[PDB]
Amino acid sequence: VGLTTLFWLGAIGMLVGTLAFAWAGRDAGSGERRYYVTLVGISGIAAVAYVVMALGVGWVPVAERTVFAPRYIDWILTTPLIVYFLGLLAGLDSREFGIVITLNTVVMLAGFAGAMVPGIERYALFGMGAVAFLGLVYYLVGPMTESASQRSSGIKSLYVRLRNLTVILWAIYPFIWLLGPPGVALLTPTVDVALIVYLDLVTKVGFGFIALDAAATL
Ligand SMILES: [Cl-]
């Protein structure tokens, strides 16, 4: 199994999620539609990014490594949508959304920038992202959880389930980044991509399926 193959697998998984979310939201009352649309965009954008990488585009040479630019474009656009989904579920107002969305953006921008910087100073960008990430986790586990507590028992339960999925799985990315080509380059590009393809699929499609389950049960 090579990079190309791993990218195709990611494209296929994202496509399956995209189609399922689009279908399940066919009707969608008039206030629940928002959730389905966000899911379609999250997995849809990732699907495109993976096909692009699978076709060999965006493989940017940096120092003695390769940076998959599409992955980062994908993250920058999709992770804020995931955060939006959680904030909607938690019942946040504009100001609340604004804070978590910017922290999220700082994480992804710093990571992309760090990956694109050849020198050892790139770790300074990585650190910036790590710090903003802790801020994001704080909001997810604190204020946003407090806000969610004002919703029905089911919604609060779905929020908690997805919050846990997000906090735990997202916290893993920085380590894979630090151990893979972007950092120490211990893990080969293939192993790093394999691990990240799984993580992207679960944080997006796994995330979506869990939500659909809750919606159905509700
Ligand atoms: Cl990369």
**Domains of the chain, residue spans:** 1-218
The set of long-range contacts for 186-190, using a CB threshold of 8 Å and a minimum separation of 24, is 189/3, 189/65, 189/66, 190/1, 190/2, 190/3, 190/6
Q: CB of 156 within 8 A of CB of 149?
A: yes
Sign of the C-alpha dihedral computed for residues 111, 79, 76 and 186 taken in this order: positive
Query: What's the gap in Å between 140 CA and the centre of ligand 1?
Result: 26
Q: Identify the CA nearest to 107 among candidates 126, 82, 87, 84.
A: 126
Resolution (A): 2.3
Query: What's the gap in Å between 71 CA and the centre of ligand 1?
Result: 7
Query: What's the gap in Å between 112 CA and the centre of ligand 1?
Result: 8
Say what the alpha-carbon torsion angle 173, 76, 74, 158 is, to the nearest 10 degrees.
Answer: 70
Query: What's the gap in Å between 160 CA and the centre of ligand 1?
Result: 31
Measured between alpha carbons, how far is 84 from 152 in angstroms, rounded to an integer?
Answer: 19
Query: What's the gap in Å between 93 CA and the centre of ligand 1?
Result: 34
Measured between alpha carbons, how far is 156 from 90 in angstroms, rounded to an integer?
Answer: 7
Put residue 58 in one of left, alpha, beta given phi > 0 → left and psi -120 to 50 → alpha: left
- In the three-class reduction of DSSP (H, G, I as helix; E, B as strand; rest coil), residue 55 is classed as coil
Measured between alpha carbons, how far is 122 from 119 in angstroms, rounded to an integer?
Answer: 6
Query: What's the gap in Å between 69 CA and the centre of ligand 1?
Result: 7
Query: What's the gap in Å between 66 CA and the centre of ligand 1?
Result: 6
Half-sphere exposure of 36 (CA within 13 A, CB side): 19
Q: How far is CA 214 from CA 146, 153, 200, in A?
A: 20, 12, 21
**Residues of the chain by 3-state class (helix, strand, coil), percent to 5:** 80, 5, 20
Query: What's the gap in Å between 62 CA and the centre of ligand 1?
Result: 10
Query: What's the gap in Å between 67 CA and the centre of ligand 1?
Result: 4
Q: CB of 87 within 8 A of CB of 100?
A: yes
Say what the alpha-carbon torsion angle 149, 43, 180, 138 is, to the nearest 10 degrees.
Answer: -10
Measured between alpha carbons, how far is 71 from 52 in angstroms, rounded to an integer?
Answer: 9
User: Which one-letter amino acid corresponds to residue 153?
Assistant: S
- In degrees and rounded to multiples of 5, residue 179 shows phi and psi of -90, -25
Strand segments (E) across 41-186: 59-62, 65-68
Measured between alpha carbons, how far is 82 from 88 in angstroms, rounded to an integer?
Answer: 10
Give me 89's structure tokens: 């579920």
Q: Which CATH class is domain 1-218?
A: mainly alpha
Query: What's the gap in Å between 68 CA and the centre of ligand 1?
Result: 4
